Amino acid sequence: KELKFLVVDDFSTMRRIVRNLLKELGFNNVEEAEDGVDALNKLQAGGYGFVISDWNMPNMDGLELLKTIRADGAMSALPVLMVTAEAKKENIIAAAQAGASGYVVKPFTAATLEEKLNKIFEKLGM
Ligand SMILES: [Mg+2]
């Protein structure tokens, strides 16, 4: 599957981990973004096929980034995997209403990530 991923997380250590987990699953075309604003700049360049986004981030959080993607004429169907942390239980109902493609709690292993990605590829038909 030739898919270009965008990994968005305000902690540089976590972006690196997720990127290396994707590399182990065979995905080598992975770009990183620091928050929702940075993510908008990368997405506008085009070519992205999947977004993995942390929920809590400064400047623009994962929910506002999701809602922006979903309102965009060309990118409204872009899959978005929402990432939450044990620290805070998020407003899942709002992400579900905005069309999140799925949810996963970090930290996660490549095995868990693979199972989440396979489930989304199947449910959406990618
Ligand atoms: Mg964060």
Resolution value, angstrom units = 1.8
Q: How far is the CA of 28 from the centre of ligand 1 (A)?
A: 23
Q: Domains of the chain (ranges plus CATH)?
A: 1-126 (3.40.50.2300)
Binding-site residues:
9-10, 54, 56
Strands 102-106 and 50-54 turn out to be: unpaired
User: Phi/psi of residue 100, each to 5°?
Assistant: -70, 145
Cis peptide upstream of residue 58 (ω within 30 degrees of 0): no
Task: Say how many C-beta atoms besides its own lie within 10 A of residue 101's C-beta.
Answer: 20
Give the residue numbers of the binding site for Mg(2+): 9-10, 54, 56
Q: By what method was this entry solved?
A: X-ray
Distance 93 CA to ligand 1 centre (A): 19
H or E, element range at 105: strand 102-106
Ligand 1 centre and the CA of 42: distance in Å? 18
Rg, C-alpha atoms of the chain: 13
Residue 76 vs residues 12, 32, 58, 64, 116: alpha-carbon distances, Å: 27, 20, 23, 14, 21
54: three-class secondary structure by DSSP:
strand
Contact 86, 63 (CB under 8 A): no
Contact 3, 29 (CB under 8 A): yes
* Secondary structure string (H, E, C) spanning 44-100: HCCCCCEEEEECCCCCCCHHHHHHHHHHCCCCCCCCEEEEEECCECCCHHHHHHCCC
- In the sheet with 50-54, reading across from the earlier edge strand, the strands are 30-33, 5-8, 50-54, 80-85, 102-106
> Is the separation of the CB atoms in 65 and 85 below 8 Å?
no
- On whether the CB atoms of residues 39 and 51 are closer than 8 A, the answer is yes
**Helix H or strand E encompassing 121:** helix 110-124
